[PDB]
Write an enzyme that holds these catalytic residues in place. Structure first.
Site, PDB file in Angstrom:
ATOM      1  N   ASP A   1     -74.067-127.776 120.080  1.00  0.00           N
ATOM      2  CA  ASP A   1     -74.922-128.692 120.836  1.00  0.00           C
ATOM      3  C   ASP A   1     -74.719-130.131 120.404  1.00  0.00           C
ATOM      4  O   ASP A   1     -74.678-131.005 121.260  1.00  0.00           O
ATOM      5  CB  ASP A   1     -76.396-128.343 120.655  1.00  0.00           C
ATOM      6  CG  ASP A   1     -76.896-127.298 121.636  1.00  0.00           C
ATOM      7  OD1 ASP A   1     -76.363-127.147 122.754  1.00  0.00           O
ATOM      8  OD2 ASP A   1     -77.854-126.592 121.345  1.00  0.00           O
ATOM      9  N   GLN A   2     -74.621-130.356 119.093  1.00  0.00           N
ATOM     10  CA  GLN A   2     -74.512-131.718 118.513  1.00  0.00           C
ATOM     11  C   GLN A   2     -73.154-132.385 118.738  1.00  0.00           C
ATOM     12  O   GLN A   2     -73.033-133.623 118.587  1.00  0.00           O
ATOM     13  CB  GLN A   2     -74.922-131.729 117.016  1.00  0.00           C
ATOM     14  CG  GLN A   2     -76.352-131.148 116.782  1.00  0.00           C
ATOM     15  CD  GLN A   2     -77.413-131.831 117.658  1.00  0.00           C
ATOM     16  OE1 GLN A   2     -77.308-133.032 117.963  1.00  0.00           O
ATOM     17  NE2 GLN A   2     -78.408-131.067 118.112  1.00  0.00           N
TER      18      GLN A   2
ATOM     19  N   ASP B   1     -81.431-118.119 120.163  1.00  0.00           N
ATOM     20  CA  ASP B   1     -81.425-119.418 120.837  1.00  0.00           C
ATOM     21  C   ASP B   1     -82.839-119.821 121.286  1.00  0.00           C
ATOM     22  O   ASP B   1     -83.597-118.989 121.770  1.00  0.00           O
ATOM     23  CB  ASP B   1     -80.506-119.349 122.054  1.00  0.00           C
ATOM     24  CG  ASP B   1     -80.371-120.671 122.766  1.00  0.00           C
ATOM     25  OD1 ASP B   1     -79.804-121.606 122.171  1.00  0.00           O
ATOM     26  OD2 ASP B   1     -80.808-120.822 123.913  1.00  0.00           O
ATOM     27  N   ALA B   2     -83.161-121.099 121.101  1.00  0.00           N
ATOM     28  CA  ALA B   2     -84.352-121.765 121.677  1.00  0.00           C
ATOM     29  C   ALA B   2     -85.635-120.926 121.596  1.00  0.00           C
ATOM     30  O   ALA B   2     -86.314-120.612 122.602  1.00  0.00           O
ATOM     31  CB  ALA B   2     -84.072-122.248 123.065  1.00  0.00           C
TER      32      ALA B   2
ATOM     33  N   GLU C   1     -83.285-120.668 116.228  1.00  0.00           N
ATOM     34  CA  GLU C   1     -82.980-122.055 116.599  1.00  0.00           C
ATOM     35  C   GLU C   1     -84.277-122.649 117.128  1.00  0.00           C
ATOM     36  O   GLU C   1     -84.654-122.386 118.255  1.00  0.00           O
ATOM     37  CB  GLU C   1     -81.908-122.139 117.682  1.00  0.00           C
ATOM     38  CG  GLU C   1     -81.506-123.588 117.869  1.00  0.00           C
ATOM     39  CD  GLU C   1     -81.458-124.079 119.309  1.00  0.00           C
ATOM     40  OE1 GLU C   1     -81.095-125.262 119.478  1.00  0.00           O
ATOM     41  OE2 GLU C   1     -81.763-123.348 120.271  1.00  0.00           O
TER      42      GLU C   1
ATOM     43  N   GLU D   1     -91.555-137.636 124.879  1.00  0.00           N
ATOM     44  CA  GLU D   1     -91.731-136.458 124.012  1.00  0.00           C
ATOM     45  C   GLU D   1     -92.846-136.635 122.978  1.00  0.00           C
ATOM     46  O   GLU D   1     -92.962-135.833 122.047  1.00  0.00           O
ATOM     47  CB  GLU D   1     -90.438-136.190 123.228  1.00  0.00           C
ATOM     48  CG  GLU D   1     -89.298-135.676 124.062  1.00  0.00           C
ATOM     49  CD  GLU D   1     -88.091-135.333 123.217  1.00  0.00           C
ATOM     50  OE1 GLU D   1     -88.236-135.152 121.990  1.00  0.00           O
ATOM     51  OE2 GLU D   1     -86.988-135.243 123.796  1.00  0.00           O
TER      52      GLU D   1
ATOM     53  N   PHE E   1     -82.047-132.621 109.360  1.00  0.00           N
ATOM     54  CA  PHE E   1     -80.964-133.015 108.454  1.00  0.00           C
ATOM     55  C   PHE E   1     -79.756-133.542 109.247  1.00  0.00           C
ATOM     56  O   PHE E   1     -79.220-134.644 108.951  1.00  0.00           O
ATOM     57  CB  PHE E   1     -80.504-131.825 107.607  1.00  0.00           C
ATOM     58  CG  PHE E   1     -79.313-132.148 106.735  1.00  0.00           C
ATOM     59  CD1 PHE E   1     -79.487-132.798 105.484  1.00  0.00           C
ATOM     60  CD2 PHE E   1     -78.003-131.816 107.154  1.00  0.00           C
ATOM     61  CE1 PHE E   1     -78.363-133.097 104.656  1.00  0.00           C
ATOM     62  CE2 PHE E   1     -76.886-132.117 106.330  1.00  0.00           C
ATOM     63  CZ  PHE E   1     -77.093-132.771 105.072  1.00  0.00           C
ATOM     64  N   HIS E   2     -79.330-132.771 110.238  1.00  0.00           N
ATOM     65  CA  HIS E   2     -78.203-133.191 111.113  1.00  0.00           C
ATOM     66  C   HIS E   2     -78.448-134.587 111.705  1.00  0.00           C
ATOM     67  O   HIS E   2     -77.547-135.464 111.641  1.00  0.00           O
ATOM     68  CB  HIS E   2     -77.940-132.220 112.278  1.00  0.00           C
ATOM     69  CG  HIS E   2     -77.054-132.811 113.338  1.00  0.00           C
ATOM     70  ND1 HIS E   2     -77.527-133.658 114.320  1.00  0.00           N
ATOM     71  CD2 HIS E   2     -75.701-132.791 113.483  1.00  0.00           C
ATOM     72  CE1 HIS E   2     -76.514-134.099 115.051  1.00  0.00           C
ATOM     73  NE2 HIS E   2     -75.394-133.599 114.546  1.00  0.00           N
ATOM     74  N   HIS E   3     -79.631-134.769 112.313  1.00  0.00           N
ATOM     75  CA  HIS E   3     -79.973-136.021 112.991  1.00  0.00           C
ATOM     76  C   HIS E   3     -80.003-137.201 112.018  1.00  0.00           C
ATOM     77  O   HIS E   3     -79.469-138.297 112.333  1.00  0.00           O
ATOM     78  CB  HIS E   3     -81.306-135.890 113.706  1.00  0.00           C
ATOM     79  CG  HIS E   3     -81.325-134.821 114.776  1.00  0.00           C
ATOM     80  ND1 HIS E   3     -80.180-134.204 115.246  1.00  0.00           N
ATOM     81  CD2 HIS E   3     -82.348-134.302 115.490  1.00  0.00           C
ATOM     82  CE1 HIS E   3     -80.500-133.343 116.195  1.00  0.00           C
ATOM     83  NE2 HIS E   3     -81.809-133.381 116.360  1.00  0.00           N
TER      84      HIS E   3
HETATM   85  O1  GLC Z   1     -84.391-131.895 117.501  1.00  0.00           O
HETATM   86  C1  GLC Z   1     -85.502-132.302 118.281  1.00  0.00           C
HETATM   87  C2  GLC Z   1     -85.096-132.034 119.724  1.00  0.00           C
HETATM   88  O2  GLC Z   1     -84.794-130.656 119.842  1.00  0.00           O
HETATM   89  C3  GLC Z   1     -84.250-130.423 121.127  1.00  0.00           C
HETATM   90  O3  GLC Z   1     -83.563-129.206 121.217  1.00  0.00           O
HETATM   91  C4  GLC Z   1     -85.435-130.454 122.066  1.00  0.00           C
HETATM   92  O4  GLC Z   1     -85.085-129.930 123.321  1.00  0.00           O
HETATM   93  C5  GLC Z   1     -85.831-131.919 122.164  1.00  0.00           C
HETATM   94  O5  GLC Z   1     -86.909-132.073 123.065  1.00  0.00           O
HETATM   95  C6  GLC Z   1     -86.135-132.486 120.768  1.00  0.00           C
HETATM   96  O6  GLC Z   1     -86.083-133.879 120.887  1.00  0.00           O
END
Ligand code: GLC
Ligand SMILES: OC[C@H]1O[C@H](O[C@H]2O[C@H](CO)[C@@H](O)[C@H](O)[C@H]2O)[C@H](O)[C@@H](O)[C@@H]1O
Ligand SMILES: OC[C@H]1O[C@H](O[C@H]2O[C@H](CO)[C@@H](O)[C@H](O)[C@H]2O)[C@H](O)[C@@H](O)[C@@H]1O
Ligand code: GLC
Ligand code: MG
EC number: 3.2.1.141
Length: 580
Positions: A387-388, A262-263, A295, A363, A317-319
């Site tokens: 998350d999505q 994660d992260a 991730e 950002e 891709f998801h976004h």
């Molecule tokens: O996918 C891009 C995004 O990832 C998120 O998990 C970040 O926290 C965010 O700041 C960014 O806009």
């Protein structure tokens, strides 16, 4: 010549001794003046070894209950292997040698062979346990996924949670089952020929139940912070080893095939050897075929090519996909136009941002790096994940968002499941599940009240603390048997079968993959020595005949799969076809 820093002889926590001699208890403390172990109610002073190391061996065995006593304060073991009374309670001594594994003929799974299926143990079944989850393994095998991606299991406070509040990283969360119930789940998956991956959180500890600072404040630093507390100090070798020890546990002792970190951008480390690199060294020292995924939102190939991780969850891709289907623009969705041409580009490049300006307000920076070094399996793609879905105020799924049709949802599945990138599905996605996946927690007292208030202010929003929010996120298995759920499920089965069986779709090289568009029709072409496949997805509002799509090659003529089961090569709004 990398040598692991871990030796079972010096393992922190409670470890069964050989020859039925009992248990060796060890801890590290930088500040305590008096140090004891309290086992089954009885205190025993521990031996000081130097370096803040304390040790004691006693003839107690697996099942014994204990915690440590630091300057007279009873303190839970951060290295606890199980916490049957939760994160403030006594640990149980666990012997990993006692479980009868039957998976000797299982040898892990390559990334290029993974189709991930993301499971939240608490909501995946009514019972919300490993034992109930294991009963769904044959369903998953028949469905055609090949690797279960399990959300975090580290013990956290309360009776439900996503897992990102994990505090005792070595202790499987008791409400889900006992250590042997988890082993039973992995063993069963392996017997069915399914991989099992675990989500682990090495960038922060949860706000309740993390007692590491009670032993040594230097596990942490005030230089930077996490969401919940002081940042994890990777300059401190005991902090390094806390997480590399944990990674090795999950892989070796619980037989996991891989970890999802994660992260990773928030695993801050300025050491000569980055913690991510050392993690890869430590897990590979096990001499298995275990994988590490990150991730990571930075679009940074060095994760693979320098840290030697296997792949990266890449949300571009998801976004691009979601914005294509909804037009939404809040938050990071503002980074994307969506549409056929945009999707063609993002797939072509693996991720969209390779150094260009990210203009998202609050950002703004130059985001990402050239993706050239990365190969198709290195990118993990999805159209849904925890998350999505869960980071939406109502936790609604893609087909439940305003202005998304089931036809578009089914088209999106065909694109995802035919791409050579490594796909992930979220539980229930495959039958267009009716239930949301909402953010839920169960923290105590003031902290619980703060979470509820925090969620309300951030965006009626379902209260994360309410039992109903957890229950509303439970999968309804019966619904998949009927109507549009069953229709969606049939398509998912057909897509996963094609992915498995189709000799051209076996392609895992970006060299063989091209994309483009004609108006609102996206095309994705794969050409290998085995043949040619073209995926066409009509992202327009009108009907398009495949014959009228302008393509820089001759379209293949044989209809292999149509997302709405049509006989002719015509695409209704949102529909897709695979031709060969
Ligand atoms: O996918 C891009 C995004 O990832 C998120 O998990 C970040 O926290 C965010 O700041 C960014 O806009
Ligand atoms: O700053 C992090 C890294 O940036 C570069 O690496 C990326 O960009 C290169 C081309 O610009 C690519 O070849 C490479 O695959 C990317 O990871 C730089 O080359 C690295 O040394 C930096 O660590
Ligand atoms: O209709 C006004 C909007 O048009 C564009 O957005 C649409 O078209 C995109 C493809 O170019 C889709 O991905 C998106 O879902 C649609 O909403 C334009 O990009 C927007 O800024 C306009 O508001
Ligand atoms: O607290 C004394 C010492 O304890 C351990 O050696 C830590 O690894 C070290 O960084 C620290 O300096
Ligand atoms: Mg045109």
């Amino acid at each position: 010549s990398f040598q692991t820093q871990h030796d079972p002889r010096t393992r922190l926590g409670a470890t069964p001794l050989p020859g039925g001699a009992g248990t060796r208890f060890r801890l590290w403390t930088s500040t305590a003046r008096t140090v004891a172990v309290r086992v089954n109610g009885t205190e025993h002073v521990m031996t000081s070894l130097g370096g803040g190391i304390y040790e004691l061996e006693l003839p107690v065995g697996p099942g014994a209950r204990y915690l440590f006593v630091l300057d007279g304060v009873p303190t839970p073991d951060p290295y606890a292997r199980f916490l049957p009374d939760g994160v403030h309670g006594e640990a149980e001594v666990v012997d990993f040698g006692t479980f009868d594994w039957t998976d000797a003929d299982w040898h892990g799974i390559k990334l290029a062979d993974c189709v991930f299926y993301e499971v939240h143990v608490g909501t995946f079944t009514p019972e919300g346990t490993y034992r109930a989850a294991a009963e769904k393994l044959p369903y998953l095998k028949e469905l055609g996924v090949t690797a279960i991606q399990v959300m975090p299991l580290a013990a956290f406070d309360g009776q439900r949670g996503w897992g990102y509040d994990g505090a005792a990283f070595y202790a499987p969360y008791a409400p889900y089952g006992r250590p042997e119930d988890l082993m039973a789940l992995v063993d069963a998956a392996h017997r069915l020929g399914l991989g099992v991956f675990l989500d682990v959180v090495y960038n922060h500890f949860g706000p309740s139940g993390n007692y590491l600072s009670s032993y040594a404040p230097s596990y942490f630093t005030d230089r930077f912070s996490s969401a919940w507390g002081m940042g994890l100090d990777y300059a401190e070798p005991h902090m390094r080893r806390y997480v590399t020890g944990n990674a090795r546990m999950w892989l070796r002792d619980y037989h996991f095939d891989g970890l999802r970190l994660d992260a990773t951008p928030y695993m801050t480390d300025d050491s000569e050897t980055h913690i991510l690199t050392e993690l890869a060294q430590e897990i590979h020292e096990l001499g298995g075929t275990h994988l590490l995924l990150a991730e990571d939102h930075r679009n940074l190939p060095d994760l693979v090519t320098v840290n030697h991780l296997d792949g990266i969850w890449t949300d571009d891709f998801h976004h691009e996909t979601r914005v294509t289907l909804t037009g939404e623009q809040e938050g990071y969705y503002a980074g994307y136009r969506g549409g056929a041409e945009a999707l063609a580009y993002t797939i072509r490049r693996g991720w969209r941002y390779e150094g260009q300006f990210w203009a998202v307000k609050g950002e703004e920076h130059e985001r990402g790096h050239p993706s050239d070094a990365l190969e198709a399996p290195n990118f993990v793609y999805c159209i849904q994940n925890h998350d999505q879905i869960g980071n939406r105020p109502l936790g609604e799924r893609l087909h439940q968002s305003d202005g998304v049709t089931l036809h578009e949802y089914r088209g999106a599945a065909a694109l995802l499941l035919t791409l050579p990138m490594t796909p992930l599905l979220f539980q229930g996605q495959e039958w267009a599940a009716s239930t949301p996946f909402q953010f839920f927690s169960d923290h105590a007292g003031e902290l619980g009240q703060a979470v509820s208030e925090g969620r309300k202010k951030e965006f009626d929003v379902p209260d994360p603390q309410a039992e109903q929010t957890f229950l509303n996120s439970k999968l309804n298995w019966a619904e998949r048997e009927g109507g549009e759920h069953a229709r969606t499920l049939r398509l998912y089965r057909d897509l996963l079968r094609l992915r498995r069986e189709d000799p051209v779709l076996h392609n895992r090289q970006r060299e063989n993959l091209t994309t483009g568009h004609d108006g609102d029709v996206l095309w994705v072409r794969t050409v290998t020595g085995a043949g040619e496949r073209v995926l066409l997805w009509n992202l327009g509002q009108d009907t398009r005949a495949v014959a009228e799509v302008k393509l820089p090659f001759t379209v293949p003529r044989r209809l292999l799969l149509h997302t709405e089961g049509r006989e002719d090569l015509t695409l209704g709004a949102g529909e897709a076809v695979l031709v060969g």
